[PDB]
Design an enzyme around this catalytic site. Structure first.
Site, mmCIF file in Angstrom:
data_model
loop_
_atom_site.group_PDB
_atom_site.id
_atom_site.type_symbol
_atom_site.label_atom_id
_atom_site.label_comp_id
_atom_site.label_asym_id
_atom_site.label_seq_id
_atom_site.Cartn_x
_atom_site.Cartn_y
_atom_site.Cartn_z
ATOM 1 N N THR A 45 -5.033 4.708 7.770
ATOM 2 C CA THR A 45 -5.317 3.397 7.188
ATOM 3 C C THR A 45 -5.999 2.545 8.260
ATOM 4 O OG1 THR A 45 -3.064 2.671 7.655
ATOM 5 C CG2 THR A 45 -3.475 3.450 5.435
ATOM 6 N N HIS A 52 2.519 8.738 0.782
ATOM 7 C CA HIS A 52 1.274 8.720 0.033
ATOM 8 C C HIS A 52 1.472 9.653 -1.164
ATOM 9 C CE1 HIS A 52 -0.695 6.737 3.464
ATOM 10 N NE2 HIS A 52 0.113 7.516 4.216
ATOM 11 N N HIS A 56 0.828 -1.197 0.000
ATOM 12 C CA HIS A 56 0.000 0.000 0.000
ATOM 13 C C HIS A 56 0.868 1.255 0.000
ATOM 14 C CE1 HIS A 56 -0.097 -1.564 4.291
ATOM 15 N NE2 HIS A 56 0.257 -0.301 4.589
ATOM 16 N N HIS A 115 6.327 6.626 6.153
ATOM 17 C CA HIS A 115 5.815 6.125 4.894
ATOM 18 C C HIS A 115 5.224 7.278 4.103
ATOM 19 C CE1 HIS A 115 2.612 6.037 7.824
ATOM 20 N NE2 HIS A 115 1.888 6.457 6.772
ATOM 21 N N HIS A 134 4.854 10.669 6.217
ATOM 22 C CA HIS A 134 4.363 10.543 7.579
ATOM 23 C C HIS A 134 5.432 9.916 8.454
ATOM 24 C CE1 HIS A 134 -0.152 10.662 6.276
ATOM 25 N NE2 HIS A 134 0.393 11.877 6.355
HETATM 26 N N1 LIG Z 1 -0.842 6.559 7.588
HETATM 27 S S1 LIG Z 1 -0.580 6.925 9.128
HETATM 28 O O1 LIG Z 1 -1.771 7.492 9.632
HETATM 29 O O2 LIG Z 1 0.627 7.694 9.203
HETATM 30 C C1 LIG Z 1 -0.265 5.404 9.978
HETATM 31 C C2 LIG Z 1 0.735 5.367 10.940
HETATM 32 C C3 LIG Z 1 1.080 4.157 11.534
HETATM 33 C C4 LIG Z 1 0.417 2.984 11.180
HETATM 34 N N2 LIG Z 1 0.734 1.748 11.813
HETATM 35 C C5 LIG Z 1 1.760 1.305 12.560
HETATM 36 S S2 LIG Z 1 3.148 2.209 12.925
HETATM 37 N N3 LIG Z 1 1.585 0.031 12.959
HETATM 38 C C6 LIG Z 1 2.422 -0.766 13.791
HETATM 39 C C7 LIG Z 1 3.105 -0.109 14.818
HETATM 40 C C8 LIG Z 1 3.864 -0.820 15.731
HETATM 41 C C9 LIG Z 1 3.929 -2.182 15.604
HETATM 42 F F1 LIG Z 1 4.639 -2.882 16.534
HETATM 43 C C10 LIG Z 1 3.286 -2.873 14.599
HETATM 44 C C11 LIG Z 1 2.529 -2.154 13.684
HETATM 45 C C12 LIG Z 1 -0.597 3.038 10.220
HETATM 46 C C13 LIG Z 1 -0.939 4.245 9.617
HETATM 47 ZN ZN LIG Z 2 0.508 7.562 6.485
#
Ligand SMILES: NS(=O)(=O)c1ccc(NC(=S)Nc2ccc(F)cc2)cc1
Ligand SMILES: [Zn+2]
Ligand SMILES: *[C@@H]1O[C@H](CO)[C@@H](O[C@@H]2O[C@H](CO)[C@@H](O)[C@H](O)[C@H]2NC(C)=O)[C@H](O)[C@H]1NC(C)=O
Ligand SMILES: *[C@@H]1O[C@H](CO)[C@@H](O)[C@H](O)[C@H]1NC(C)=O
Length: 277
Positions: free
Chosen positions: A209, A96, A65, A94, A119
């Protein structure tokens, strides 16, 4: 499962497939409205800083994604109060972006979309001892949003890709999900110096997400860092994961949410910061 481009699993369906919390009323992204927002002079310059003792490697993954940089533990930090005491620890970064140059960001500023939004995700280490403890808990996360804009005339050294070290050249058509590669470390402090770190929007919102958890302190800088068309096109070379309808990765942004949907039980406010003038 979810996607951006398959209408069966796409953003319009998240509120039903992930009611906790994609059906909530403190969702992100939002339109960042300069006129509507409340200037709060107490909000300080953001600082990003490294632990110089850290030697662990950085990696990047095509997760199907987005392109997602994963930082080693105990390496990069955010300070919002001027003290360098590790209250916020950075986990990953990451991106977008759009199929075309006139869209791609998740946030808008006065309705305007940028080509690329980065982000930088951190957890409130001040309260929670690990990323996995923080990611599902109240007040666990703080994300920085970095807008990027395309210019035609610029030296590589003054573009964001200098801070990114070109992502060690990993952004290409053969970088297929769910492949991960070691990359050179990202100089996040240099990245931040490419924009004004005192000039930003601030609000309480969510991951963008699924499952859209409402535990994100958002900071979105108003001034963009600069990139080239060539650089944006590298991201567009990545393939989407197999659950998307579109083949090449692009338009991997969530539609705009309201600051205060009609069903809200307690309105939130959009804040703005500027430098001690
Ligand atoms: N697009 S966002 O809003 O920036 C966004 C930011 C972060 C995440 N998920 C994360 S960091 N997951 C995760 C974190 C720690 C773990 F040990 C395992 C998975 C999704 C969207
Ligand atoms: Zn993001
Ligand atoms: C990242 O990419 C650039 C561009 O491919 C690399 O090298 C040069 O820097 C200029 C400066 O504006 C670029 O426009 C040129 O394309 C390149 N010129 C030559 C002949 O070297 C840069 O070295 C790369 N960085 C790393 C460390 O990988
Ligand atoms: C900095 O890195 C060193 C060596 O990896 C580590 O032991 C130390 O705890 C880190 N400092 C932090 C997380 O504040």
């Amino acid at each position: 499962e979810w996607s951006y481009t398959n209408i069966l699993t796409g953003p319009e369906t998240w509120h039903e497939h992930y009611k906790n919390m994609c059906s909530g009323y403190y969702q992100s992204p939002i339109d960042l409205k300069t006129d509507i927002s409340t200037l709060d002079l107490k909000l300080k310059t953001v600082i990003i800083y490294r632990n110089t003792s850290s030697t662990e490697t950085t990696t990047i993954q095509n997760n199907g994604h987005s392109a997602e940089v994963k930082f080693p533990r105990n390496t990069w930090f955010i300070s919002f109060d001027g003290i360098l005491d590790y209250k916020y620890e950075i986990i990953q970064m990451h991106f977008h972006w759009g199929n075309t140059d006139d869209r791609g960001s998740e946030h808008t500023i006065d309705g305007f979309r940028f080509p690329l939004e980065g982000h930088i995700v951190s957890f409130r280490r001040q309260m929670y001892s690990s990323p996995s403890e923080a990611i599902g808990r109240p007040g666990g996360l703080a994300v920085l949003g970095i807008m990027h804009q395309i210019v035609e005339s610029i030296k590589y050294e003054q573009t964001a890709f200098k801070a990114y070290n070109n992502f060690s050249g990993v952004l290409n058509s053969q970088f297929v999900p769910p492949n991960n590669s070691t990359i050179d470390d990202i100089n996040l402090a240099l990245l931040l110096s490419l924009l004004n770190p005192s000039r930003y929007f601030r609000y309480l919102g969510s991951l963008t997400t699924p499952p859209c958890t409402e535990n994100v302190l958002w900071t979105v800088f108003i001034d963009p860092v600069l990139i080239t068309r060539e650089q944006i096109n590298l991201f567009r070379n990545l393939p989407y994961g197999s659950n998307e309808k579109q083949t090449r990765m692009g338009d991997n942004f969530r539609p705009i949410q309201l600051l205060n949907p009609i069903d809200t039980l307690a309105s939130r406010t959009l804040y703005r910061a500027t430098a001690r003038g």
